[PDB]
Point group: C2
Chain length 66, copies 2
């Protein structure tokens, strides 16, 4: 299938709809110019006692903190 | 802003549409019963000279390696 949901997304090669050379991602709160965000970048402000969600340094999603 | 895109998803509390207690995810190739898949679980079969995509153990998406 495709690495980018949209054919407009320049993070993917138009021909293959796979990520372009160098690229690690095409979308998500932890994607920055087709690269993963640095490990520990805050990606979701938490409320109550909960810790903030942070980037993994190895994926483009913002995960629940673990 | 909900942690699950579907109201039917039992990984999320129906009242808040946030993850249920203990839950880490509700969707994705690296989610297994509302928990993250073990680090290094293969989530995408690669072709040519490329390594396979593996689960991080810290997220529910299957990332590029």
């Amino acid at each position: 299938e495709c690495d980018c949901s949209s054919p407009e997304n320049p993070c993917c090669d138009a021909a293959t709809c796979k990520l372009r050379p160098g690229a690690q991602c095409g979308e998500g709160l932890c994607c920055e110019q087709c690269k993963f965000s640095r490990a520990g970048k805050i990606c979701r402000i938490a409320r109550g006692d909960m810790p903030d969600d942070r980037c993994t340094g190895q994926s483009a999603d913002c995960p629940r903190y673990h």
